[PDB]
Amino acid sequence: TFLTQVKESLSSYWESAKTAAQNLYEKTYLPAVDEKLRDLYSKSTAAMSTYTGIFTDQVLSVLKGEE
């Protein structure tokens, strides 16, 4: 790749900020899951892995009909 690389690059720079900000939030603080538990579901077939991106897609595109 190349184009997509630049994206994940600039985003990665801030990704960590979103990571440490997520963990302290409710990603690991007290989610009551954490991979070991957040994998059986989001791995059956990307139930929550790729759906996290399809969740909102079915909100704006269903609430405003635009996505």
mmCIF file of C-alpha atoms in Angstrom:
data_model
loop_
_atom_site.group_PDB
_atom_site.id
_atom_site.type_symbol
_atom_site.label_atom_id
_atom_site.label_comp_id
_atom_site.label_asym_id
_atom_site.label_seq_id
_atom_site.Cartn_x
_atom_site.Cartn_y
_atom_site.Cartn_z
ATOM 1 C CA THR A 1 0.000 0.000 0.000
ATOM 2 C CA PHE A 2 0.911 3.686 0.152
ATOM 3 C CA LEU A 3 -2.054 6.054 0.419
ATOM 4 C CA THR A 4 -3.746 4.190 3.276
ATOM 5 C CA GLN A 5 -0.327 3.966 4.930
ATOM 6 C CA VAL A 6 -0.066 7.742 5.324
ATOM 7 C CA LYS A 7 -3.462 7.721 7.026
ATOM 8 C CA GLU A 8 -2.693 5.044 9.592
ATOM 9 C CA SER A 9 0.556 6.956 10.052
ATOM 10 C CA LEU A 10 -0.848 10.380 10.913
ATOM 11 C CA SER A 11 -3.667 8.713 12.830
ATOM 12 C CA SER A 12 -1.293 6.386 14.660
ATOM 13 C CA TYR A 13 0.511 9.425 16.038
ATOM 14 C CA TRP A 14 -2.698 10.286 17.860
ATOM 15 C CA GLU A 15 -3.894 6.672 18.137
ATOM 16 C CA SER A 16 -1.820 6.244 21.293
ATOM 17 C CA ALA A 17 -3.452 9.326 22.760
ATOM 18 C CA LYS A 18 -6.799 7.728 22.008
ATOM 19 C CA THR A 19 -5.520 4.468 23.480
ATOM 20 C CA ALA A 20 -4.332 5.774 26.844
ATOM 21 C CA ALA A 21 -7.477 7.893 26.835
ATOM 22 C CA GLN A 22 -9.636 4.841 26.135
ATOM 23 C CA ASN A 23 -8.057 2.520 28.698
ATOM 24 C CA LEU A 24 -8.480 4.996 31.540
ATOM 25 C CA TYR A 25 -11.971 5.628 30.175
ATOM 26 C CA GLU A 26 -13.569 2.194 30.086
ATOM 27 C CA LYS A 27 -11.414 0.066 27.776
ATOM 28 C CA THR A 28 -9.618 -1.745 30.596
ATOM 29 C CA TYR A 29 -10.356 0.313 33.730
ATOM 30 C CA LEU A 30 -13.583 -1.520 34.529
ATOM 31 C CA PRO A 31 -15.060 -2.831 31.237
ATOM 32 C CA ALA A 32 -15.569 -6.257 32.802
ATOM 33 C CA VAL A 33 -14.244 -7.896 29.653
ATOM 34 C CA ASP A 34 -10.836 -7.050 28.155
ATOM 35 C CA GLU A 35 -9.889 -9.088 25.068
ATOM 36 C CA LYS A 36 -10.064 -12.444 26.891
ATOM 37 C CA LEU A 37 -13.746 -11.603 27.111
ATOM 38 C CA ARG A 38 -13.864 -9.096 24.237
ATOM 39 C CA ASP A 39 -12.650 -11.646 21.691
ATOM 40 C CA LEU A 40 -15.086 -14.563 21.798
ATOM 41 C CA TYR A 41 -17.766 -12.206 20.492
ATOM 42 C CA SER A 42 -15.722 -9.865 18.285
ATOM 43 C CA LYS A 43 -13.994 -12.850 16.712
ATOM 44 C CA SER A 44 -16.898 -15.187 15.945
ATOM 45 C CA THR A 45 -16.815 -13.320 12.650
ATOM 46 C CA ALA A 46 -15.893 -9.733 13.548
ATOM 47 C CA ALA A 47 -19.022 -9.325 15.640
ATOM 48 C CA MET A 48 -17.530 -6.230 17.268
ATOM 49 C CA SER A 49 -14.159 -5.926 15.513
ATOM 50 C CA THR A 50 -15.297 -4.633 12.124
ATOM 51 C CA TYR A 51 -18.816 -3.848 13.343
ATOM 52 C CA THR A 52 -17.473 -0.938 15.378
ATOM 53 C CA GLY A 53 -17.217 0.745 12.011
ATOM 54 C CA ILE A 54 -20.559 -0.528 10.736
ATOM 55 C CA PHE A 55 -22.373 0.475 13.918
ATOM 56 C CA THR A 56 -22.355 4.202 13.202
ATOM 57 C CA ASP A 57 -22.667 3.572 9.464
ATOM 58 C CA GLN A 58 -26.151 2.234 10.168
ATOM 59 C CA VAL A 59 -26.944 5.239 12.373
ATOM 60 C CA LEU A 60 -26.367 8.349 10.271
ATOM 61 C CA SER A 61 -27.382 6.444 7.139
ATOM 62 C CA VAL A 62 -30.518 5.371 8.987
ATOM 63 C CA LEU A 63 -31.174 8.517 11.015
ATOM 64 C CA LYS A 64 -30.349 11.065 8.340
ATOM 65 C CA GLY A 65 -30.237 8.651 5.426
ATOM 66 C CA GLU A 66 -26.718 9.808 4.643
ATOM 67 C CA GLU A 67 -24.249 7.905 6.848
#
